[PDB]
Structure 1
Amino acid sequence: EDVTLRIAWWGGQPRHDYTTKVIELYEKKNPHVHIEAEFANWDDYWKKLAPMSAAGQLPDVIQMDTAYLAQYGKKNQLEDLTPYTKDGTIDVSSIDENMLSGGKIDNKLYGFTLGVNVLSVIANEDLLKKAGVSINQENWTWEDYEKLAYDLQEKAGVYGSNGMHPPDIFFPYYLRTKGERFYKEDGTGLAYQDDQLFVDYFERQLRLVKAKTSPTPDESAQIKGMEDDFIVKGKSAITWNYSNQYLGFARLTDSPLSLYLPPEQMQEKALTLKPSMLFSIPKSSEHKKEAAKFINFFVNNEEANQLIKGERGVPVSDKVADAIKPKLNEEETNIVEYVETASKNISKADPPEPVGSAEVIKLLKDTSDQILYQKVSPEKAAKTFRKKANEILERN
Structure 2
Amino acid sequence: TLRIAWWGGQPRHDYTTKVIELYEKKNPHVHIEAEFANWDDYWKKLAPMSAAGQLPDVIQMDTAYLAQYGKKNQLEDLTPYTKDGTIDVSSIDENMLSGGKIDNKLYGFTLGVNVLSVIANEDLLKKAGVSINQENWTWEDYEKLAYDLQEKAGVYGSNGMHPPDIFFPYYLRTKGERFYKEDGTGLAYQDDQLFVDYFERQLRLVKAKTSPTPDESAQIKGMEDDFIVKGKSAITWNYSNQYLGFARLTDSPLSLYLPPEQMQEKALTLKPSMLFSIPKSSEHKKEAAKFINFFVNNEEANQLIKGERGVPVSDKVADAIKPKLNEEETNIVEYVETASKNISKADPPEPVGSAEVIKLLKDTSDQILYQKVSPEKAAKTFRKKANEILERN
Tell me if both proteins adopt one fold, taking TM over 0.5 as the criterion.
yes
Q: Structure 1 residues 312, 378: CA separation in 2 closer, same or farther (over 3 Å shift)? A: closer
* d(CA) in 2 for partners of 1:43, 1:295: 24
Aligned-pair distance for 1:123? 0.3
Q: Compare 265-274 and 76-85 and name the one that shifted more.
A: 76-85
Indicate whether 1:324 and 2:321 are aligned: yes
SS state at 2:243 partner:
helix
Q: Deviation digits for residues 157-192 of structure 1, max 9, x if unmatched?
A: 322111112212211111122221212223222111
TM-score normalized by structure 2? 0.76
Aligned-pair distance for 1:247? 2.8
Aligned-pair distance for 1:201? 0.5
- Contact (CA 8 Å) 2:117, 2:257: kept in 1 or not? yes
Structure exhibiting the larger radius of gyration computed from Cα positions: 1
Q: Structure 1 residues 215, 337: CA separation in 2 closer, same or farther (over 3 Å shift)? A: same
Aligned-pair distance for 1:279? 4.7
* d(CA) in 1 for partners of 2:343, 2:78: 24
SS state at 2:131 partner:
coil
- Contact (CA 8 Å) 1:99, 1:273: kept in 2 or not? no
Q: Structure 1 residues 232, 144: CA separation in 2 closer, same or farther (over 3 Å shift)? A: same
Q: Structure 1 residues 259, 77: CA separation in 2 closer, same or farther (over 3 Å shift)? A: same
Q: Compare 156-165 and 272-281 and name the one that shifted more.
A: 272-281
- Contact (CA 8 Å) 1:98, 1:273: kept in 2 or not? no
Q: Deviation digits for residues 199-256 of structure 1, max 9, x if unmatched?
A: 1111111222233322233433443333433222322210112233323322332311
SS state at 2:256 partner:
strand
Indicate whether 1:287 and 2:273 are aligned: no
Partner of 2:111: 114
Q: Structure 1 residues 197, 305: CA separation in 2 closer, same or farther (over 3 Å shift)? A: same
SS state at 1:62 partner:
strand
Q: Structure 1 residues 358, 112: CA separation in 2 closer, same or farther (over 3 Å shift)? A: closer
Q: Deviation digits for residues 334-380 of structure 1, max 9, x if unmatched?
A: 23333333344333334333333333223222322332233322212
SS state at 2:110 partner:
strand
Q: Structure 1 residues 49, 174: CA separation in 2 closer, same or farther (over 3 Å shift)? A: closer
Q: Structure 1 residues 151, 372: CA separation in 2 closer, same or farther (over 3 Å shift)? A: same
Aligned-pair distance for 1:72? 6.2
Q: Structure 1 residues 43, 369: CA separation in 2 closer, same or farther (over 3 Å shift)? A: closer
* d(CA) in 2 for partners of 1:57, 1:375: 40
- Contact (CA 8 Å) 2:67, 2:351: kept in 1 or not? no
Aligned-pair distance for 1:118? 2.7
Aligned-pair distance for 1:41? 12
Q: Structure 1 residues 98, 118: CA separation in 2 closer, same or farther (over 3 Å shift)? A: farther
Q: Deviation digits for residues 12-32 of structure 1, max 9, x if unmatched?
A: 999899789879989999999
- Contact (CA 8 Å) 1:158, 1:235: kept in 2 or not? yes
Aligned-pair distance for 1:119? 2.0
Instruction: Choose which of 374, 383, 387 in structure 2 pairs with 1:386.
Output: 383
* d(CA) in 2 for partners of 1:78, 1:157: 48
State the number of aligned residues.
393
Aligned-pair distance for 1:315? 0.7
SS state at 2:184 partner:
coil
Q: Structure 1 residues 166, 295: CA separation in 2 closer, same or farther (over 3 Å shift)? A: closer
SS state at 1:145 partner:
helix
- Contact (CA 8 Å) 2:184, 2:352: kept in 1 or not? yes
Q: Structure 1 residues 55, 268: CA separation in 2 closer, same or farther (over 3 Å shift)? A: same
* d(CA) in 2 for partners of 1:42, 1:154: 32
Aligned-pair distance for 1:93? 6.9
TM-score normalized by structure 1? 0.75
Q: Structure 1 residues 37, 259: CA separation in 2 closer, same or farther (over 3 Å shift)? A: closer
SS state at 1:259 partner:
strand
Identity fraction in percent: 100
Q: Deviation digits for residues 50-80 of structure 1, max 9, x if unmatched?
A: 9999999999987655467536643678776
Indicate whether 1:69 and 2:66 are aligned: yes
* d(CA) in 1 for partners of 2:132, 2:353: 38
Q: Compare 328-337 and 71-80 and name the one that shifted more.
A: 71-80
SS state at 2:35 partner:
strand
Aligned-pair distance for 1:319? 3.9
Q: Compare 53-62 and 269-278 and name the one that shifted more.
A: 53-62
Q: Deviation digits for residues 89-148 of structure 1, max 9, x if unmatched?
A: 977675455532321211444433122333221100011112222222223221221222
Q: Which runs of 5+ in 1 are unaligned?
A: none
Q: Compare 339-348 and 258-267 and name the one that shifted more.
A: 339-348
Indicate whether 1:42 and 2:53 are aligned: no
